[PDB]
Design a protein around this ligand. Sequence first.
Ligand code: K07
Ligand code: K07
Ligand code: CL
Ligand code: MG
Ligand code: MG
Ligand code: MG
Ligand code: MG
Lengths: 194, 194
Amino acid sequence: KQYIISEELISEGKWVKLEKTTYMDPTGKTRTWESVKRTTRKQTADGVAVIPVLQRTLHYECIVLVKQFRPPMGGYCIEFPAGLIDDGETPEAAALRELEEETGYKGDIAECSPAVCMDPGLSNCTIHIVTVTINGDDAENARPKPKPGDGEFVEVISLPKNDLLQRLDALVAEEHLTVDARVYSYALALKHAN
Amino acid sequence: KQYIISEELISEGKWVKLEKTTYMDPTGKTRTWESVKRTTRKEQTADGVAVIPVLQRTLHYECIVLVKQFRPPMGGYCIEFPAGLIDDGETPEAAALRELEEETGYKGDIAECSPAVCMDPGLSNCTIHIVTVTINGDDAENARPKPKPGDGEFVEVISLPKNDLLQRLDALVAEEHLTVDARVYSYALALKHA
Ligand SMILES: CN(C[C@H]1CCOC1)c1ncncc1Cl
Ligand SMILES: CN(C[C@H]1CCOC1)c1ncncc1Cl
Ligand SMILES: [Cl-]
Ligand SMILES: [Mg+2]
Ligand SMILES: [Mg+2]
Ligand SMILES: [Mg+2]
Ligand SMILES: [Mg+2]
């Protein structure tokens, strides 16, 4: 009963554009919305985010996250490993590649979500969330080598899955970092389960 | 090591603006980024709230209360946690309880409130507080919950059992064209992984 009539380009950059979307409201009245989109989608979705479960025997299971400066935020964020999917790449392949590049870890796909929206009131951006296990006992993961691409600068922070929310709160409290909403949502549900 | 040097307006809408951000990289080299921001943030500790609403009812499994809405940036229907922007002067907790009531009819009780978390930090400065709220579904105030949609709001309520959340979302996305929100999907994933 609601649907897009048209979009008016407001401003296009190299990586992001602003549109004015005209849409039919469910009363039959026509309305406008200021919407953001990337210019980079070609693609099941814009990006992948990797939930990476690091499994070492006789250790707590950890979730591997990354810390980076994020120029939109003017600060450092803690996030799942993630990046945009290349033209021609499957989400799974993007997932394993971004993981290795951002963490050095070599991972196995467990499951892959449908495209899920990042901030649907504002943008059209979507990602596939990709759950990956990391056999931390395997020789290839002994000395994980992060491969930063041009201008990427990423730190690895592995936290125990069993205390995840508490540990993220501590980092925020002590280190003035911003935790990602999806990382937080996952850390919350780990506590809320049962 | 990395900090913002300058922020230059590119295009300012009524709701959304695009900036050219200049930052210092960790090799000491200057770089730029195209950054999205809202025009609506003043002294609020974040732009918005999202509510994790746990519906509780004697001899019922706990449900997670979700909402389905047309999202003009997505050109489609999305399933999300109840959410809205924080009014000027409003606390995140007040915003959460208000938005929960407006979008679902339910009167909740605050359980916990996250720090400001980042929505899509490689793209925007948008932040929310994630507020967990319990709903006493045995109270008569929550018997026949009536959504109070604002001007241009038209929200459908969808309550799903916590203990089957991921499969029930999968089953909804197999029945019609519609996107599940990344924070919801992340939360439903963690409920499986725990
Ligand atoms: C945040 N708002 C305004 C309020 C009005 C009631 O619902 C949202 C936007 N409105 C149009 N285009 C973009 C945005 Cl971000
Ligand atoms: C998509 N990119 C660059 C790629 C290169 C490696 O990280 C993401 C952007 N570059 C500047 N401003 C905004 C965006 Cl979104
Ligand atoms: Cl797992
Ligand atoms: Mg990345
Ligand atoms: Mg990368
Ligand atoms: Mg809302
Ligand atoms: Mg609202």
